[PDB]
């Protein structure tokens, strides 16, 4: 039964299961070791319904399965698909949020504090991604991953802090749902936020659930 499998393994094996877990606000990225059963119980969800939704998704194999891919290919993919994108996405969202918080300051639904939280995420993620690209990822490419417990534990602590920031961003934005009086800039910014959350969760998932454990295992 899918409920007895870890969230991370389900997300990495079933196409769009990541999107299903995002719908249910289950942390498959930094909390990807927990079983679906445990995650669903904490959130008081009907786990049979979720198993049926996963079964329908699992009719196809995942288009690209990273679980057994070479660690160097995973690293190069992370840098181009996630690190480079975050470095473009977040400055753009910071400026959009600034504009929304000023233009709609008088409105009740305006996401006050959003700029602040995006800025914190950008600063913390920027420094973090530089340390991966300059220290940890080269160490893994050199074959020293089995010696990386310390560095990986530091990176995984930052992942938890990034997850905390994501929760604050989601709360500030009514789970990234714009109000009815949202103009196009506001709505477009929320689409960008959802894209950032989707990407960052898949990115952390690939590191926590594939790259880091396999590196430590000597692969
Ligand atoms: Cl969860
Ligand atoms: Mn990374
Ligand atoms: Mn990372
Ligand atoms: O990251």
Overview in brief:
Homodimer. This protein has 219 residues and is mainly α. It is built from 8 helices and no strands.
Describe the fold and architecture:
The protein is mostly helical. The longest helix is centred in the middle third of the chain and has 33 residues, at 71-103. The chain has one domain (1-219). It is built from 8 helices and no strands. The two termini are 29 Å apart. The site of one manganese (II) ion (MN) has 6 residues, from helix 5, helix 6 and helix 8.
List keywords for this structure.
monomer; 219 residues; mainly alpha; 0% strand; binds chloride ion; binds manganese (II) ion; binds oxygen atom; metal binding protein; di-iron; monomeric; Iron-sulfur cluster repair protein YtfE
Using the alpha-carbon principal axes, give the shape. globular
Rg, rounded, reads 18 Å
The N- to C-terminal Cα distance equals 29 Å
Largest sheet: none
Strand content is under 5%
How many individual helices?
8
Kindly state the number of beta strands: 0
Give the bound compounds.
Answer: chloride ion, manganese (II) ion, oxygen atom
Tally of distinct domains: 1
Structural class: mainly alpha
Order of secondary-structure elements: HHHHHHHH
Question: Helix amount, in percent?
Answer: 55-70%
Family: Belongs to the RIC family. YtfE subfamily.
Keywords: Cytoplasm, Iron, Metal-binding, Stress response
InterPro entries: FeS-repair_YftE (IPR023742), Hemerythrin-like (IPR012312), RIC_family (IPR019903)
Subcellular location: Cytoplasm
């Amino acid at each position: 039964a899918y409920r007895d499998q870890p969230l991370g393994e389900l997300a990495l094996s079933i196409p769009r299961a990541s999107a299903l877990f995002r719908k249910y606000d289950m942390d498959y990225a930094a909390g990807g070791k927990q079983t679906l059963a445990r995650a669903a119980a904490r959130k008081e969800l009907d786990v049979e319904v979720i198993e049926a939704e996963l079964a329908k998704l699992a009719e196809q194999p995942i288009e690209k399965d990273w679980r057994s891919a070479p660690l160097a290919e995973i690293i190069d993919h992370i840098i181009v698909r996630y690190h480079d994108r975050h470095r473009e996405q977040l400055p753009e969202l910071i400026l959009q949020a600034t504009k929304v918080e000023r233009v709609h300051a008088d409105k009740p639904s305006v996401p006050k504090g959003l700029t602040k939280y995006l800025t914190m995420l950008h600063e913390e993620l920027s420094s973090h991604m530089m340390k991966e690209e300059q220290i940890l990822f080269p160490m893994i490419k050199q074959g020293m991953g089995s010696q990386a417990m310390g560095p990986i534990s530091v990176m995984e602590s930052l992942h938890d802090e990034a997850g905390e920031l994501l929760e604050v961003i989601k709360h500030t934005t009514n789970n990234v749902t714009p109000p009815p009086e949202a103009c196009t800039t506001w709505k477009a910014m929320y689409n960008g936020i959802n894209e950032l959350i989707d990407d960052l969760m898949d990115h952390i998932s690939l590191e926590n659930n594939v790259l880091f454990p396999r590196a430590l295992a000597g692969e």
